[PDB]
Amino acid sequence: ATIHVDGKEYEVNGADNLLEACLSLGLDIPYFCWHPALGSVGACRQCAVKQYQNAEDTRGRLVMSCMTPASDGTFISIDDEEAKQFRESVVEWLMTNHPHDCPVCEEGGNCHLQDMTVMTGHSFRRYRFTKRTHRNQDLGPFISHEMNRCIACYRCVRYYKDYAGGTDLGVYGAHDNVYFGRPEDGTLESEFSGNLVEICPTGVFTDKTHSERYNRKWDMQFAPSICQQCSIGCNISPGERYGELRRIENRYNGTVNHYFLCDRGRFGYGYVNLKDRPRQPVQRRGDDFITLNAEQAMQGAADILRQSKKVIGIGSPRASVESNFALRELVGEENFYTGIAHGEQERLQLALKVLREGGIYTPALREIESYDAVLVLGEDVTQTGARVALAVRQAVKGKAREMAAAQKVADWQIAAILNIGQRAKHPLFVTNVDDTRLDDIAAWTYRAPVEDQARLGFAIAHALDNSAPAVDGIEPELQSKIDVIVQALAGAKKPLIISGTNAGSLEVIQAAANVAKALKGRGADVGITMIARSVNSMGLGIMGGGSLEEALTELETGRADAVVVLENDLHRHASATRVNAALAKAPLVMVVDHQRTAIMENAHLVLSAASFAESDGTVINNEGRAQRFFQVYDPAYYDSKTVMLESWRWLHSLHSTLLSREVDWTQLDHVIDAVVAKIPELAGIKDAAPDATFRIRGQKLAREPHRYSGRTAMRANISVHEPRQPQDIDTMFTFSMEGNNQPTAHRSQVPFAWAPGWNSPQAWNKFQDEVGGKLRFGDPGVRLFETSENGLDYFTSVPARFQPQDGKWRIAPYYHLFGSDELSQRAPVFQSRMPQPYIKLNPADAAKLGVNAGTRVSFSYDGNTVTLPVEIAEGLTAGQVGLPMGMSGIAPVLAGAHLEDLKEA
């Protein structure tokens, strides 16, 4: 199209509204109620521009730019006096009841309302009457509530209800007494309640975890990183102050996690600030855990490895590509073992084979929202890959969007979208051992054991295409439901099959692969998504290695007398007794870790590794996209005796000391080159981010904002002499003010969004090419593998029915967003949000044992009896028993396994 803004010609998209078209061009228009993801409602009355009918018009007409489409030849004015007077008046009306709270408000310096008050030029108050006040509700441990600061812009209710699909946040009252919150006191039950701290333009919803140890946005040292709490790999901005990780802000990625994270990845960062973490290397001599610096620890470790007959290495899916590869070089690729069990590794390798050899295009997380039918097989998406569940909700509302678009309604008229789309929505068929959080919008939910879920998928694949292996033993009404699912998937333009490794069944993955292949063979634009468990599970699968059982047999037989455990607690993937016995038999245990685990008591040496906040590296997400995360802060800047190095740095210097008897603290780009030389299937991680020589017109990228304060006084209590600015030889970033964070800088790794006049999270509008689109100069991250030309073949191994045998109980995994990822359970703010460990039972099974709800029953697995209180699950099937995966004592490896001696305590 063509618009005339103050006489200047501009070329914009004709389908866009005028506010987003003018914001894409860099023009500044105040706005509150419009969000790029939530659509438009036109409440705040802030985006007024004067539109003219033709080229020569004097009076014009004041119009709302978030309702006005950017049609061809549209003449508007922004800076003329009438529009500025109206926008200043609207800001003034918002400022009548606003509390005098900016010094004691967590949004100060990060406030959209402050930015728009300053931008409109309104600074003189002529209101002398009283201001309305509101009582503050309790929203739980994550979100702090303060309703005095609200401007009634309706963004919270729009996001939480329409977008996030929540049910316990609403607007109450009329006129100026509108109240936004829950009907009563309680925790916000949505898994994406944390995004309200960025959706809300004011300080109504604030980060309570940040509020405990609060600092302003200009004082925060930011870095671009990847969230380490599940396999989705949402881009984040961890920001620190005074040596502790303070906040996790959302980092815009137009491909993955544009405006939204989940609650686990926003509030589960508290394990970094734990005081029991190893900070210096520790050697156990006799029973004395003495403390070394880096050099003597490396020398002694290299010696004690040098007179050992065989050294094995147990990596982890928590660790990065570089650290696992450095361990692989240290011990040799024959003696390198992945830290996961055999069944988990089999499921992970099958998921990788489906992704990179199945011939079906795996979609990006932003691209999930543009699919017409979703079949989720076996994966509890909301509890394991929650952001994928949010994107699935968007794809389900896509039917209402399409129905509105068929009747001359644009995509930003979300009110008309919901008016036309009353209750019609895209088909969603979720399958699990119990009820999920997607069942409120799902067209069908199938509660069945994982064998029966796999059989459902196999029957769907056979009904879609007769070349798939058939299933015998389908009940007729279940067959009618298969026909309904097949009719929904066949009529869809873009179907999407979502599975993963969390179900604990290979056959569900095989069934999802066969459904995707059958839909591909009909000519549909089918996509397949696979949810892995940990942050770098796909990278560990691509790198490969032996399973944990092989390493345990090597330690127990005596062929290996030296074990190097990299960032693995070893109890989540194997039984505790076997791991403890194997590590007790081994005369040399060396744990390279950043979290105090149970295996460090048996460890002979502990290398204090760094977490994601104090290290760089590359992680591969569930879609196969390599993503680089950078160090946020130097740990030794505040505590000089802290020796907390990168895991790959520790292992590379250990290998160098073992070989040539000197320490070699390498550079990250050297390890990247070693990975892309030794491992050609990981050769794409070089393009994930540019190397340390990357500059923007000669200068590096600044970690901290321009107004970083206190630099001559933040360490003055230790010494009045200012220390060294920490030098970053690994990355293109600097630990200082002196860098570049321009929105027009030719770069993709943006540490934080800030623009002059835009201090809120709305500065991402300045950092994007067009608002709500991609990051300018491309989104960061690169896919490792392309879609294969030829696919796989149909998996003929159709599993049998689940037969409940007496005395044996099938463990059904019940994942929790707060409690399954180990590092998140380490966080102290998650210990109040997580539920108490309850064992889930069928009513028929509870009647058979004669136990009621809440009774403590004991069960013995691997020779250890543990007691749990019983919760009655109606959606479970008979012969199964529900257990919470990931909690203390209940490893996620227990999923899909039998359980013995289920009796009342």
Partner 1 sequence: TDFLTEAHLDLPMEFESIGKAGSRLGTALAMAVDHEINMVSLVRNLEEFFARESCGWCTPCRDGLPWSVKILRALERGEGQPGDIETLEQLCRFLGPGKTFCAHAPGAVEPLQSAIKYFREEFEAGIKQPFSNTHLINGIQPNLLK
Partner 2 sequence: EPAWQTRDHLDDPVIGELRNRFGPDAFTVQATRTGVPVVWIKREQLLEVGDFLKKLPKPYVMLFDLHGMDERLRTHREGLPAADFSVFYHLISIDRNRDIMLKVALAENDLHVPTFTKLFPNANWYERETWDLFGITFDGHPNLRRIMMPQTWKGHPLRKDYPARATEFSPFELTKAKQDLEMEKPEEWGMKRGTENEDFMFLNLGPNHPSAHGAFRIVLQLDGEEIVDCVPDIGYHHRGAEKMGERQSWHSYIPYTDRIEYLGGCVNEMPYVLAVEKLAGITVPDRVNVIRVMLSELFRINSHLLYISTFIQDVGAMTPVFFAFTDRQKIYDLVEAITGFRMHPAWFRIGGVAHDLPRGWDRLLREFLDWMPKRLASYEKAALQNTILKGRSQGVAAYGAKEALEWGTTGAGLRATGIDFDVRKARPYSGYENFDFEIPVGGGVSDCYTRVMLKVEELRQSLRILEQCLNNMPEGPFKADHPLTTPPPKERTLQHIETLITHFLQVSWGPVMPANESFQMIEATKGINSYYLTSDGSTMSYRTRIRTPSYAHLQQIPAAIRGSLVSDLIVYLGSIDFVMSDVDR
Residue closer to partner 2, measured from CB, 120 or 621:
120
Compute CA distances 716 → 220, 634, 638, 641, 723, whole Å: 18, 17, 10, 17, 10
- Sign, Cα dihedral of 38, 41, 44, 45: positive
Minimal distance in Å, beta carbon 63 to ligand SF4? 16
Q: Does 47 bind ligand FES (CB under 6 A)?
A: yes
Residue closer to ligand FES, measured from CB, 48 or 496:
48
- Chosen from Ca ion, ligand FES, partner 1, none, partner binding at 730 (C-beta under 5 to 8 Å by type): Ca ion
Cα separation, 231 vs 233, in Å, equals 6
Cα separation, 581 vs 153, in Å, equals 61
Which has the closest alpha carbon to 205: 158, 264, 138, 117? 138
Minimal distance in Å, beta carbon 751 to partner 2? 17
How many residues sit close enough to ligand SF4 to count as binding (CB under 6 A)?
Answer: 38
Query: Considering only residues 68, 580, 667, 740, which one is a binding residue for partner 2 as defined by CB under 8 A?
Result: 740
**Other Cβ atoms within 10 Å of 559 Cβ, number:** 12
DSSP state of 163: I
- Chosen from ligand FES, partner 1, partner 2, none, partner binding at 47 (C-beta under 5 to 8 Å by type): ligand FES
Minimal distance in Å, beta carbon 153 to ligand FES? 7
- Chosen from partner 1, ligand SF4, partner 2, none, partner binding at 386 (C-beta under 5 to 8 Å by type): ligand SF4
DSSP state of 317: S
Interacting residue ranges for Ca ion, rule: CB under 5 A: 616, 631, 730
Write the interaction track for ligand SF4 spanning residues 332-371; mark x where CB under 6 A is met and - where it is not.
----------------------------------------
Gyration radius (Cα) of the chain, Å: 28
Write the interaction track for partner 2 spanning residues 681-710; mark x where CB under 8 A is met and - where it is not.
--------------x-xxx------xx---
Task: Annotate 755-772 with DSSP letters as a single string.
Answer: BTTB-SGGGGTTTBSSTT
Q: Does 476 bind partner 2 (CB under 8 A)?
A: no
Q: Does 178 bind partner 1 (CB under 8 A)?
A: yes
Q: Does 70 bind ligand FES (CB under 6 A)?
A: no
Stretch that binds partner 2, among 364-372, 438-446, 731-739, 865-873 (CB under 8 A): 731-739
Minimal distance in Å, beta carbon 711 to partner 2? 9
Stretch that binds partner 2, among 70-78, 100-108, 259-267, 300-308 (CB under 8 A): 100-108
- 3-class SS at 416? helix
Query: Considering only residues 25, 27, 43, 102, which one is a binding residue for partner 2 as defined by CB under 8 A?
Result: 102
Cα separation, 16 vs 24, in Å, equals 10
H/E element, 883: strand 880-883
Task: Annotate 674-716 with DSSP letters as a single string.
Answer: HHHHH-GGGGGGGGSS--TT--BTTB-EESS-TT---TTTTTT
Q: Does 726 bind partner 2 (CB under 8 A)?
A: no
Q: Does 414 bind ligand SF4 (CB under 6 A)?
A: no
Residue that has been written with the tokens 């970053």 in this structure: 728
Minimal distance in Å, beta carbon 105 to partner 1? 20
- Chosen from Ca ion, ligand SF4, partner 1, none, partner binding at 421 (C-beta under 5 to 8 Å by type): none
Stretch that binds ligand FES, among 27-35, 504-512, 619-627, 779-787 (CB under 6 A): 27-35
Minimal distance in Å, beta carbon 817 to ligand SF4? 8
Minimal distance in Å, beta carbon 322 to Ca ion? 11
Minimal distance in Å, beta carbon 167 to ligand SF4? 16
Q: Does 52 bind partner 1 (CB under 8 A)?
A: no
Q: Does 46 bind ligand FES (CB under 6 A)?
A: yes
Stretch that binds ligand SF4, among 102-110, 317-325, 513-521, 691-699 (CB under 6 A): 102-110
Q: Does 109 bind partner 2 (CB under 8 A)?
A: yes
Minimal distance in Å, beta carbon 632 to partner 1? 39
Q: What residue type is assigned to position 220 of the chain? A: M
DSSP state of 99: -
Which has the closest alpha carbon to 189: 849, 818, 672, 878? 818
Q: Does 235 bind partner 2 (CB under 8 A)?
A: no
Rounded to the nearest 10 degrees, the angle between the axes of helix 321-331 and helix 668-678 is 70
Minimal distance in Å, beta carbon 764 to partner 2? 17
Query: Considering only residues 491, 757, 843, 889, which one is a binding residue for partner 2 as defined by CB under 8 A?
Result: 757
Cα 497 to chain centroid, rounded: 20
Q: Does 100 bind partner 2 (CB under 8 A)?
A: yes
Stretch that binds ligand FES, among 26-34, 159-167, 499-507, 718-726 (CB under 6 A): 26-34
Q: What is the torsion angle, in degrees rounded to the nearest 10, for the CA atoms of residue 455, residue 460, residue 462 and residue 465? A: -160
Interface residues for partner 2 in 182-211 (CB under 8 A)?
none
Q: Does 747 bind ligand SF4 (CB under 6 A)?
A: no
Q: Does 86 bind partner 1 (CB under 8 A)?
A: yes
> Taking a C-beta distance cutoff of 8 angstroms, is the pair 330, 835 a contact?
no
Q: Does 156 bind ligand FES (CB under 6 A)?
A: no
Minimal distance in Å, beta carbon 31 to ligand FES? 4
Q: What residue type is assigned to position 623 of the chain? A: E
Residue that has been written with the tokens 């394991």 in this structure: 384
Stretch that binds ligand SF4, among 146-154, 407-415, 712-720, 864-872 (CB under 6 A): 146-154
Compute CA distances 892 → 133, 545, 600, 798, 830, whole Å: 48, 20, 21, 25, 18
Query: Considering only residues 16, 21, 24, 32, which one is a binding residue for ligand FES as defined by CB under 6 A?
Result: 32
Angle, alpha carbons 325-330-332 (nearest 5°): 85
Rounded to the nearest 10 degrees, the angle between the axes of helix 647-660 and helix 321-331 is 20
- The first and second tokens of residue 167, run together, are 């049910």
Q: Does 111 bind ligand SF4 (CB under 6 A)?
A: yes
Interface residues for partner 1 in 124-153 (CB under 8 A)?
125-130, 151-152
Stretch that binds ligand SF4, among 75-83, 262-270, 275-283, 480-488 (CB under 6 A): 262-270
Cα separation, 194 vs 262, in Å, equals 7
Residue that has been written with the tokens 């460990």 in this structure: 837
Cα separation, 420 vs 764, in Å, equals 31
Which has the closest alpha carbon to 531: 310, 708, 734, 378? 378
The breaks in the chain (C to N more than 2.5 Å) occur after none
DSSP state of 507: H
Which has the closest alpha carbon to 618: 560, 505, 536, 499? 536
Cα 667 to chain centroid, rounded: 28
> Taking a C-beta distance cutoff of 8 angstroms, is the pair 484, 461 a contact?
no
Cα separation, 250 vs 234, in Å, equals 8
Minimal distance in Å, beta carbon 775 to partner 2? 17
> Taking a C-beta distance cutoff of 8 angstroms, is the pair 354, 792 a contact?
yes
Which has the closest alpha carbon to 592: 643, 651, 663, 539? 651
- Chosen from ligand SF4, ligand FES, partner 1, none, partner binding at 180 (C-beta under 5 to 8 Å by type): ligand SF4
Which residues sit at the interface with ligand SF4, rule CB under 6 A? 98-99, 101-102, 105, 107-108, 111, 113-114, 149-156, 180, 199-204, 227, 229-230, 232-234, 261-262, 264-265, 385-387
Summarize as ranges the residues that interact with partner 1 (CB under 8 A).
42-46, 61-63, 86, 89-90, 93-94, 96-97, 125-130, 151-152, 154, 173-178
List contacts with partner 2 (CB under 8 A): 92, 95, 98-100, 102-103, 108-109, 113-115, 117-118, 121-125, 216, 218, 695, 697-699, 706-707, 724-725, 736-738, 740, 742, 744, 756-757, 759
- Contact residues for ligand FES, defined by CB under 6 A: 19, 31-34, 42-47, 64, 66
